[PDB]
Every structure is written in structure tokens, then in C-alpha cells.
């Protein structure tokens, strides 16, 4: 069957750590005061959860409050004991409280307020300076998280929330936030179509943090190629063979070789037979303004099918594309 992998950095955090911190079902919750918390308004609604603005009527603050939906309670407890094990660390969002809604019966995670400017303000009009900026803040986010020995499994634009005024950033929405075990087989219905890592489409399940760098990639290829969505699948199969006409079919061949995994007989009539595309094949006069040799290289070694050959945080910390950002 499948070659087992295991991540090339971070592999024996959750071992060395007492089993408090990963052993999330054991985790007892402390609850707040629910009346401390006045509802303002509906945000939005997802899957998992109803999001409301509302204030924190002990100091007057503005706090985002997630009432979440009747869920297997082991989600539930993985997403607190996360957000508190990363609590105060580098553009992490932070929980502020977790209550029990009088109405829905479930548990209500209590947010900071981030006073995010607008998503497509924020692709529109960012800067070629702003993005790297920006990609340097996700990366601290990420290297920590990382570093702590969690995956976040969805980043995507509408998870990395940006106050533009106070150059701000915070990587939010850590309901899919798994810890890293070294061999375990985790779930490839993880992240969004648009970001979802060749290791997820080819259902490989022995991943690791490296899935977070090429969700990362693809939100840079999308920035700076003004491309939304870079890979633009009609489904997981199509998503595939969407990243397969830019990276190759050779490399992706090698990929499932080296890993022993057996492709889907569904991709033989749709894969085809593709060379791999340079970088340079995506620029033209609208984006040329964002794209640099240093930004090209960058995110060539993101884009990787291989999950163990992509850079790590910490390494993409180190390339040349950060030389720029004020430090
Ligand atoms: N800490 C926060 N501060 C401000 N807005 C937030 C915060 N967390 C989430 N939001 C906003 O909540 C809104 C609704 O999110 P929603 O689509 O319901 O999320 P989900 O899919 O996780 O249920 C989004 O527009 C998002 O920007
Ligand atoms: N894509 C897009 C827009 C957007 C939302 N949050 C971001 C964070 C960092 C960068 Br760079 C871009 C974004």
C-alpha cells in the first residue's frame, strides 16, 4: 500500500508536551458569563457555525461571538483546546471566552474584534509591498502554529482577516485545526476547493503542516498573478488536472510513484498529458506591477507537488522575496 511520510520539521512536538495539551476529549472547559455578551448583529452563517457581532457590555469592547451548530463534540473541544494551546501567539486570533448560548444549547466561542477591511479592498488595492508584508505576518502565524504542533488545514483569503489601518493581521476559523501526530491518517476533506493540497485531491492521508505552505502558495499565486482562483476546479477531480496543466503530469506521476499511491481511475480520461508551465507564462500587463524574479522563485517552491519538498515556514521566512519588509 501507500509509503508512509512524516513531516521534516516539528515531528515530535505533541510527544514531548504532557498529554494535557493534545489530549483534547480529556479537556475540561471553564465557562464564562453569558449575559456578559449583548448580540449586535448577524455576520454571517456557515456549515459549523452562526457568527454575530456583539459587545462586551463589562468594557464596553466590540467581540465577535460563534454560536456554533449542533456538531460531533470532539470538533468542538479540538477547536477550543486549539485556540487556547496558540492564545498570545504571533497574529494568532485570540479567544476571549467560551459561554453557553441560552438559545442554540451549544457552545459560543468569544473573538477579539479585528476591524478587517474589506476582503476585495484587500485584493484589489493591496501593494506589491503590502503582500509581501502581509505574506511575512501569515508566515509568523503559520510558523507558530506549526511550531506548537497544529495544522490550521484551511487558509484561504477569508481566514486571514487584515485591519489595513493599523497593518494588522490575524489567521482565523480554526475549526478544521488538527494536531500533527507523526503517522497518523488524517481526513482529506480539508480546506477549500481552490486550496486544497495535491496530497488532499490524490487521497493521500499521511499529510502534515507542509499542506498549510501550499494553501499559502495558492493564495500568493492568486495575489500576485490578479488570478481568483489560481487553480480553478469544477470539482476535486477538475481541481487536479487544473493544477496539473500549470506543475505537469511528470512530476505529479513521480509524486504518486514515490508515495505508492494508487491514483483514482476516474483521472485516466482527464488528467492528459501536460509539461509543467514557467512562472512567466502568467504574467501580462495587468499584474506585472506584483510580480518580481524573488516572488516567481518564492512561490515555485511553495507550489510543489512533493508536500516534503516544499519550504517549511521557517524557511520561507529566510527567501529573498521578505529582503524588502521592514524588519
Ligand atoms: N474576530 C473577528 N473579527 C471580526 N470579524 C470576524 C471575526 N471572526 C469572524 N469574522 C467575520 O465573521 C463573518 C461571518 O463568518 P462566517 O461565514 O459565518 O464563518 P464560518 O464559515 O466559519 O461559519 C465573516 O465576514 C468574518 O469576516
Ligand atoms: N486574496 C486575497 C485578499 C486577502 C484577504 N486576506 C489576505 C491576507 C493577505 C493577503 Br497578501 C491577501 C489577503
Redesign the pocket.
Known amino acids: 500500500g501507500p509509503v508512509p511520510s512524516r513531516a521534516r520539521v516539528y515531528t515530535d512536538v505533541n510527544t514531548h508536551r504532557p498529554s494535557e495539551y493534545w489530549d483534547y476529549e480529556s479537556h475540561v472547559v471553564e465557562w464564562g458569563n453569558q449575559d456578559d455578551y449583548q448580540l449586535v448583529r448577524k455576520?454571517?452563517?456557515?456549515?459549523?457555525?452562526?457568527?454575530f457581532?456583539a459587545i462586551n457590555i463589562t468594557n464596553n469592547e466590540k467581540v465577535?461571538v460563534?454560536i456554533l451548530k449542533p456538531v460531533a463534540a470532539a470538533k468542538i473541544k479540538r477547536e477550543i483546546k486549539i485556540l487556547e494551546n496558540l492564545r498570545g501567539g504571533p497574529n494568532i486570533?485570540t479567544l476571549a471566552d467560551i459561554v453557553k448560548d441560552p438559545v442554540s444549547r451549544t457552545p459560543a466561542l468569544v473573538?477579539?474584534?479585528?476591524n478587517?477591511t474589506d476582503f476585495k479592498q484587500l485584493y484589489q488595492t493591496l501593494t506589491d509591498y503590502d503582500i509581501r508584508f502581509y505574506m511575512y505576518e501569515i508566515l509568523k502565524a503559520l510558523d507558530y502554529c506549526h511550531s506548537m504542533g497544529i495544522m490550521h488545514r484551511d487558509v484561504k483569503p477569508?481566514n486571514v482577516?487584515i485591519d489595513h489601518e493599523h497593518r494588522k493581521l490575524?489567521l482565523?476559523?480554526w475549526?478544521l485545526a488538527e494536531f500533527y501526530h507523526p503517522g497518523q491518517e488524517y481526513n482529506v476533506r480539508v480546506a477549500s476547493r481552490y486550496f486544497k493540497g495535491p496530497e488532499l485531491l490524490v487521497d493521500y492521508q499521511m499529510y502534515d503542516y507542509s499542506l498549510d505552505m501550499w494553501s499559502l502558495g495558492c493564495m500568493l499565486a492568486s495575489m500576485i498573478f490578479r488570478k481568483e482562483p489560481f487553480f480553478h476546479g469544477h470539482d476535486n477531480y477538475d481541481q487536479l488536472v487544473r493544477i496539473a496543466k500549470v506543475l505537469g503530469t511528470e512530476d505529479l506521476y513521480d509524486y504518486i510513484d514515490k508515495y505508492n499511491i494508487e491514483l483514482d481511475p476516474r483521472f485516466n480520461d482527464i488528467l492528459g498529458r501536460h509539461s509543467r508551465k514557467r512562472w512567466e507564462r502568467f504574467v501580462h500587463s495587468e499584474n506585472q506591477h506584483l510580480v518580481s524574479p524573488e516572488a516567481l522563485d518564492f512561490l515555485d517552491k511553495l507550489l510543489r507537488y512533493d508536500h516534503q519538498s516544499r519550504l517549511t515556514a521557517r524557511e520561507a521566512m529566510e527567501h529573498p522575496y521578505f529582503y524588502t519588509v521592514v524588519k
Open positions: 455576520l454571517g452563517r456557515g456549515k459549523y457555525s452562526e457568527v457581532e465577535v460563534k486570533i473573538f477579539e474584534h479585528v478587517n477569508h482577516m490575524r482565523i476559523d475549526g
